[PDB]
Design a protein around this nucleic acid. Structure first.
Ligand code: K
Ligand code: K
Ligand code: K
Ligand code: MG
Ligand code: MG
Ligand code: MG
Ligand code: MG
Ligand code: MG
Ligand code: MG
Ligand code: MG
Ligand code: MG
Ligand code: MG
Ligand code: MG
Ligand code: MG
Ligand code: MG
Ligand code: MG
Ligand code: MG
Ligand code: MG
Ligand code: MG
Ligand code: MG
Ligand code: MG
Ligand code: MG
Ligand code: MG
Ligand code: MG
Ligand code: MG
Ligand code: MG
Ligand code: MG
Ligand code: MG
Ligand code: MG
Ligand code: MG
Ligand code: MG
Ligand code: MG
Ligand code: MG
Ligand code: MG
Ligand code: MG
Ligand code: MG
Ligand code: MG
Ligand code: MG
Ligand code: MG
Ligand code: MG
Ligand code: MG
Ligand code: MG
Ligand code: MG
Ligand code: NA
Ligand code: NA
Ligand code: ZN
Lengths: 97, 68, 157, 197
RNA sequence: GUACUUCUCUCGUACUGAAAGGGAGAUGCAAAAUGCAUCUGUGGUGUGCACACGUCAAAUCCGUUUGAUUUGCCCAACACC
RNA sequence: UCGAACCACCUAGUAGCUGGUUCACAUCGAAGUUUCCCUCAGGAUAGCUGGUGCUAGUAGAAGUAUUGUGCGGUAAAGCAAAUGAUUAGAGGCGACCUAUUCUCAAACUUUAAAUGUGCAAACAAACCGGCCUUAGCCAACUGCAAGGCCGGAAAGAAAAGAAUUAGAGGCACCAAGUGGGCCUUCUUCGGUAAGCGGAGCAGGCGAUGCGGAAUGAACCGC
RNA sequence: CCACCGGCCCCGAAAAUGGAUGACGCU
RNA sequence: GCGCGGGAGUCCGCGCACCA
RNA sequence: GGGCGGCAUAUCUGUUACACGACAACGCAGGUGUCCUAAGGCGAGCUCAGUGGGAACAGAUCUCACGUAGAACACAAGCGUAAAAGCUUGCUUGAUUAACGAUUUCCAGUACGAAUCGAGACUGCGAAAGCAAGGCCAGCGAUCCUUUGCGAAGAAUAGGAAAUAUGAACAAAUCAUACCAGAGGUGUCAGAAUAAUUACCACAGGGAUAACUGGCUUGUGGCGGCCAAGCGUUCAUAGCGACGUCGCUUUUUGAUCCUUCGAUGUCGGCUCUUCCUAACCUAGCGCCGCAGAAGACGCUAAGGGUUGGAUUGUUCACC
């Protein structure tokens, strides 16, 4: 699948309220940080002699992932997220051919 | 071991034992929620006016009755 | 195996022979208002706002009107009770129902008779039953019997 | 044999005697059964049936409600006629939300002490059913009243709270426990508040 | 065992929001980003015991009964606002 | 006493599995089906049943007709009509075209039943002329749309085959058993067939004797 | 006197303990 | 996901690490 | 039966399916975990598959006429479509947001997936009426946990119509957490984190379920009948009989799963009795392609007989 590098869509900001040009980037998940509340609880439980205390997923079935795009406006420093369907190869091209 | 898969043999008899009840008449549960909004809003303004007229009508009946 | 939305509609959602085509202008100019009786008959050439196959051929009451759509209330039996289902369809899939044509004619005739009686006009004569007796004068009389030729003409070979 | 299929389904469950253990209730039942049998008024028959009924079906009434309904009836009554007697087969309870009431004649199975004091102070009278049977044997010029039954906690609990269009309360002791999944759109789904019937 | 007792404690008379927090009458005049005035009062409509006012039937031992219905207020309750 | 000795204790270990479960009359009386479950010898859930009622006791009724008005593609029929098969002769001219001709289709059809299935058949409704309101429609309104008020009429539904009822409607609360079925009549799918396996409509046995077919759970009568 | 096609009957029609229109029997 | 090598990406090897 | 095999485990079209709807099988014929910035949106202009007559190379391209769709719409199938829903072209991003509006399909009238009718914002195309919030209808995912986006700067003598909240003795800056909307996945698809062997074996049960006898059936096996093309040097039937077609039997193997799993002792031989006839010998007949002798093919007939040994556990087989 090919996607354009820029889109024109409704901004929605109170100071714009009109169609403007956005820059397209692909979302990527951030690093799992220490000292997150769930991570702290997991580390406390794992310490000791019990062994493995939580399930570990093994039998994966999916071969794709949904695509999330981050759109940034130049006029207003705001970001919007948009979801596309599942695909095996996502590329950004302005060639339009 | 294998068993029966599916059947509908006795179901009609069960449904008619306490009968198949009829529908609710049309003048009950006739809510207008979800209908075309512009017509809904205009009808609300008329109903508000009618309630004020109903209150005024009762006051006149009371005064006339007291005057005999 | 498969239980899709439009399963088993090969002959149900099809046009009659030499009667294909999109809806005409009479359908577009028909007026529908809340409280009317309509028949839900799917038009297979529109493919927008089509009712489910169950409601094809049912008669109901209009409860909502939108710019291009109509809301209809349809009775549907489920187990031991009857449900009033509200469906949303495009205006091209409904038509005005004649299910009360006879009853409306009955009321109008009664009003006309009432007016004539008050005006002192002449009421029409009353029909008489055909199940009464009487004299019959025959014009042509024939004998009914089984003939030999009847059996011979029953062996096509 | 005779084809009487499904004939037991036309039978109706009605109580013919009281379950009460109160001898005074039994005496009242005797008196009003006699009156209902030997008179031609619907008032006596209704009173007899309500006396037969059970405690949960004899909900109490409020003095303020009595006053409001009496006023709404009296506004359209000729000034040359006397006000009717309010009759309740049940209990009458006082109301702190209303302080000023007119003089009324009320007959009931039982009065609370506050209600009796309020009625007497306003200038009315509290009557019993034996006094009523002598004052008006056929129930002429009366006003039969009933108490409110909806609004009870049991009624508010009746039904399943997890189906669309339902607003019944669940059986739970911890108020903050049964939130989240199934009650908020952010947690999987939310029970729909409205549904066409 | 029975007789007696105070404060207190508990369930309830008010709920809602994640939380900081906030918190429910009616009518009239009016249209104020906390408006003003009165307090004997169902917020409104439809369907609704008994009672009151009439009318019509059938029966009558002629005293009255049994059914319908009109109007008023409608109790409990249901539906739509 | 040994593919992990013996003694006491945790231990009355757990068991969706097997066995048992103590008086009498009376009023009522089923299910082996739906959905979800590491679910298939088990549960939860709806249905069938009992108890308790509430409400103005003929009400918002019906496993049935009639009349009016909608829906349909099975049985039958057809190949001289579209799709797909298929035998032979003839004319024009070996091939082809032209009309024919013989036999057909669960995944073919122009046409099209019988049995079905939806709605309606005057009392919170419908019909006929005032008035009030709307921030609805239309260039406007005294036109259309909507909610009300006032007034009238009302075989309360005639006549033409022109319904009938052992015809009180509606609304709740609490809870059991069951969730292995089997047989027959018509319609059927797999199989050479089966007292074989799997379905649709209805009636039965299960849960039921009695009178008949000598004898038989299901046949005939009741 | 020849062909054709119906009723009832007969041939076609062979098993394992002695036996079954229910038994005797019935023309 | 981490380190190495052979405008960035892509590919290939090694050795590491796994709560939906 | 179980195992091996295969998914009938989530799901789509045609048929089974009995002219409303619903309806099963490890029934039949086939599909799905993708693909597309255009193959989405709109306006305009054209008419497809094929056939016939013509034009150097040319036995590709040009021209005229006919052409109800016999073409094409990403993919399986059904339906639908002709100044279009197909082909070409021009401009675009309605594949955005969408105040917790209502509804359909499954259905417990729960959710998920998919779909329908709407109200508000900003737009696209078009002269305009209008059309469009993906490619109609299969193409997908809960709690907990992780992770991303919006609570822009300015202003209130106050927390208000209008300033996101908390870390509970107070205040500042970090850090953590909370409320709303998405993403990382559970294909056993309403969602545990999982390799073998037991002939040394154990327990609770099951005739809801196999191995052996019985029962239904008779495909297979074994016995017959009817017609008559041929063989028989001649001659259909002395003796045979193809191509077809009808039956019988339960001494073979299959098919099923009704009885028995708190037990019906299981292959063969030895011993001993009895029954059947589809007749090898013994008793009578008939007929041959019967000169005699030796034989063949039938009918009545089950009264009486039907052996000794080598190899093999054998039954069977062979000498
Ligand atoms: K199907
Ligand atoms: K706030
Ligand atoms: K066998
Ligand atoms: Mg079962
Ligand atoms: Mg309350
Ligand atoms: Mg004190
Ligand atoms: Mg409370
Ligand atoms: Mg609080
Ligand atoms: Mg909040
Ligand atoms: Mg030893
Ligand atoms: Mg025990
Ligand atoms: Mg034990
Ligand atoms: Mg189990
Ligand atoms: Mg037992
Ligand atoms: Mg009974
Ligand atoms: Mg699971
Ligand atoms: Mg058992
Ligand atoms: Mg046919
Ligand atoms: Mg035909
Ligand atoms: Mg044909
Ligand atoms: Mg008539
Ligand atoms: Mg069971
Ligand atoms: Mg079976
Ligand atoms: Mg049983
Ligand atoms: Mg019987
Ligand atoms: Mg017999
Ligand atoms: Mg015999
Ligand atoms: Mg015989
Ligand atoms: Mg006999
Ligand atoms: Mg059907
Ligand atoms: Mg066009
Ligand atoms: Mg909603
Ligand atoms: Mg959804
Ligand atoms: Mg819009
Ligand atoms: Mg997710
Ligand atoms: Mg700010
Ligand atoms: Mg599942
Ligand atoms: Mg060994
Ligand atoms: Mg068995
Ligand atoms: Mg056994
Ligand atoms: Mg035994
Ligand atoms: Mg034995
Ligand atoms: Mg034994
Ligand atoms: Na599962
Ligand atoms: Na057989
Ligand atoms: Zn902006």
């Amino acid at each position: 699948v090919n996607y354009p590098k820029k889109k024109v869509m409704h901004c929605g900001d109170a100071r714009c309220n009109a169609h403007k040009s956005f820059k397209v980037v692909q979302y990527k998940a951030g690093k799992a940080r220490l000292f997150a509340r769930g991570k702290r609880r997991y580390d406390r439980k794992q310490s000791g002699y019990g062994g493995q205390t939580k399930p570990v997923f093994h039998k994966k079935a999916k071969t794709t992932k949904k695509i999330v795009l981050k759109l940034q406006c130049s006029g207003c420093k705001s970001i919007r997220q948009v979801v596309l369907k599942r695909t095996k190869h996502f590329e950004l091209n302005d060639k339009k051919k | 071991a294998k068993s029966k898969n599916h059947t509908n043999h006795n179901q009609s008899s069960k449904n008619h034992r306490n009968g198949i009840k009829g529908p609710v008449p049309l003048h009950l549960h006739n809510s207008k929620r979800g209908s075309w909004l512009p017509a809904l809003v205009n009808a609300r303004r008329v109903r508000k006016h009618n309630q004020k007229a109903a209150l005024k009508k009762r006051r006149e009946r009371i005064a006339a009755f007291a005057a005999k | 195996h498969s239980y899709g939305y439009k399963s088993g509609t090969r002959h149900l959602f099809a046009k009659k022979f030499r009667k294909h085509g999109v809806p005409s202008v009479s359908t577009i100019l028909t007026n529908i208002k809340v409280g009317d009786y309509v028949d839900v008959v799917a038009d297979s050439a529109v493919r927008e706002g089509m009712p489910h196959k169950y409601y094809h051929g049912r008669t109901g009451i209009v409860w909502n009107v939108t710019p291009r759509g109509v809301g209809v209330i349809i009775n549907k039996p489920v187990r031991t009770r009857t449900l009033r289902k509200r469906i949303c369809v495009r205006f091209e899939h409904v038509r005005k129902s004649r299910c009360q044509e006879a009853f409306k004619a009955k009321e109008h005739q009664f009003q006309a008779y009432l007016a004539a009686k008050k005006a002192g006009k002449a009421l029409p004569p009353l029909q008489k039953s055909s199940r009464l007796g009487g004299i019959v004068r025959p014009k042509n009389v024939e004998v009914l019997a089984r003939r030999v030729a009847d059996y011979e003409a029953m062996v096509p070979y | 044999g005779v084809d009487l299929t499904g004939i037991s389904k036309k039978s109706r469950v009605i109580r013919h005697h009281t379950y009460s253990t109160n001898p005074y209730i039994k005496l009242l039942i005797k008196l009003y059964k006699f009156l209902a049998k030997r008179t031609s008024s619907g008032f006596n028959k209704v009173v007899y049936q309500r006396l037969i009924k059970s405690r949960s079906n004899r909900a109490p009434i409020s003095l303020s409600r009595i006053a409001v309904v009496m006023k709404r009836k009296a506004v359209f009554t000729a000034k040359s006629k006397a006000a009717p007697i309010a009759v309740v087969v049940g209990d009458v309870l006082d109301d702190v939300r209303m302080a000023r009431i007119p003089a009324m004649r009320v007959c009931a199975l039982r009065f609370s002490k506050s209600a009796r004091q309020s009625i007497v102070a306003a200038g009315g009278e509290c009557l019993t059913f034996d006094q009523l049977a002598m004052i008006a044997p056929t129930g002429k010029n009366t006003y039969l009243l009933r108490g409110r039954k909806s609004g009870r906690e049991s009624v508010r609990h009746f039904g399943a709270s997890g189906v669309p269009g339902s607003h019944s309360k669940p059986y739970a002791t911890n108020r903050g426990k049964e939130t989240k999944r199934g009650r908020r759109t952010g947690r999987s789904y939310k029970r729909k508040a409205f549904r066409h019937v």
